[PDB]
């Protein structure tokens, strides 16, 4: 049965609530983004209205085979009416097609549901600034002070420089990037752009990218592995054994691999700046762990919330345990006392 934190009170709306079968009273199902924990339950068998971004709708039609009649795409930064209620979709700074949803309730309450997001100061100059928001449904993935990470730009600059040096030293080196879902495309697109290459991948991954409305995408990607010096592989294959196996498949055209594993936070964020990163190496294979995050850091989340000044916060991540809920409640109260709301 559907949790309270996926329901928007005083509407017939739900958000990311597809795994409970038919939700009693729901007239419109919103989907924030195309990550499987959020879409769980959606398939060609679904027959109720789904509201989402154009990119999310592309993926629902082509990958999950949801019938077109049930897909209702909405543009971004535009006031729209759904079932007699004013809504706005805003860029979440997460993966492609990911949104936050602003609900203007008939009684005058305003609710922001972040979906998954990486808070940014540019959000403080969006439509959110135009009126008071009363309730916030928050992506609390990294709601603890230990969670720091570098900017996306710092990480990309390190990746571009590392790959350019390795391939300039050895023109027979292949670059590999691991992936398991949409998101983090800039890692492999920026590396391929500095090397003057397309990115090579499986037919199933190419199909996914072709749904993302990336300008000039046909000049950037290919299914011809041979012709390209940056390859994508499942994240599970980015280890010494898998990368050796892959090198054997490529018909000797390469004699070395440099690989990237974009992760979330992992314990060592605590000590190491991006400039100090060194790879794990076994023979002619080197692997770099790079902390490229599409969720808010603690400091990013705290800045956004203290600017928004909500009257109530409803967490959407790490809500299954007491301990976790209690810890998050302590931080929200600190933030409120500090900023005076
Ligand atoms: Ni996500």
UniProtKB/Swiss-Prot annotation:
The organism's place on the tree of life at top rank: Eukaryota
Induction (UniProt): During mitosis. The mRNA encoding this protein contains an internal ribosome entry site (IRES) in its 5'-UTR. This 5'-UTR generally suppresses translation while specifically promoting expression during mitosis, when cap-dependent translation may be impaired.
Localization, UniProt: Nucleus
Tissue expression profile of the protein: Expressed in brain, heart, kidney, liver, pancreas, placenta and skeletal muscle.
Complexes and interactors: Binds constitutively to TP53BP1. Binds CDC27, which is itself a component of the anaphase promoting complex (APC). Binds PIAS1.
Family to which the UniProt record says this protein belongs: Belongs to the DNA repair metallo-beta-lactamase (DRMBL) family.
Function, in words: May be required for DNA interstrand cross-link repair. Also required for checkpoint mediated cell cycle arrest in early prophase in response to mitotic spindle poisons. Possesses beta-lactamase activity, catalyzing the hydrolysis of penicillin G and nitrocefin. Exhibits no activity towards other beta-lactam antibiotic classes including cephalosporins (cefotaxime) and carbapenems (imipenem).
Protein name, entry field: DNA cross-link repair 1A protein
The organism of origin for this protein: Homo sapiens
Residues of the full protein shown: 700 to 1040 of 1040
């Amino acid at each position: 049965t559907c949790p309270f934190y996926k329901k928007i009170p005083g509407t017939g709306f739900t958000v990311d609530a597809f795994q409970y079968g038919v939700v009693e009273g729901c007239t419109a199902y919103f989907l924030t983004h195309f990550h499987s924990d959020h879409y769980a339950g959606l398939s060609k068998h679904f027959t109720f209205p789904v509201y989402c971004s154009e990119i999310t709708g592309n993926l629902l039609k082509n990958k999950l085979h949801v019938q077109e009649q049930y897909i209702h795409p909405l543009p971004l930064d535009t006031e729209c009416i759904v079932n007699g209620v004013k809504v706005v979709l805003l860029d979440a700074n997460h993966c492609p097609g990911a949104v936050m949803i602003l609900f203007y309730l008939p009684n005058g309450t305003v609710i922001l549901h972040t979906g998954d997001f990486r808070a940014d100061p540019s959000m403080e100059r969006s439509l959110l600034a135009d009126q008071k928001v009363h309730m916030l449904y928050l992506d609390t993935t990294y709601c603890s002070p230990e969670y720091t990470f570098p900017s996306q730009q710092e990480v990309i600059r390190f990746a571009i420089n590392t790959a350019f040096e390795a391939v300039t030293l050895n023109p027979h080196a292949l670059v590999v990037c691991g992936t398991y879902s949409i998101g983090k495309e800039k890692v492999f697109l920026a590396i391929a752009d500095v090397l003057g290459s397309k990115v090579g991948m499986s037919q199933e991954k190419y199909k996914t990218l072709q749904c993302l409305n990336i300008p000039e995408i046909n000049s950037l990607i290919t299914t011809d592995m041979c012709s390209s010096l940056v390859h994508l592989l499942p994240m599970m294959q980015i280890n010494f054994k898998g990368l050796q196996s892959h090198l054997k498949k490529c018909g000797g055209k390469y004699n070395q691999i440099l690989a990237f594993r974009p992760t979330g936070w992992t314990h060592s964020n605590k000590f190491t700046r991006i400039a100090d990163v060194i790879p794990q190496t076994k023979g002619n294979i080197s692997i770099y762990g790079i902390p490229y995050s599409e969720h808010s850091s603690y400091l990013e989340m705290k800045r956004f919330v203290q600017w928004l000044k909500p009257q109530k916060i409803i967490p959407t991540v790490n809500v299954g345990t007491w301990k976790s809920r209690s810890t998050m409640e302590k931080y929200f109260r600190e933030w409120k006392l500090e900023a005076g709301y």
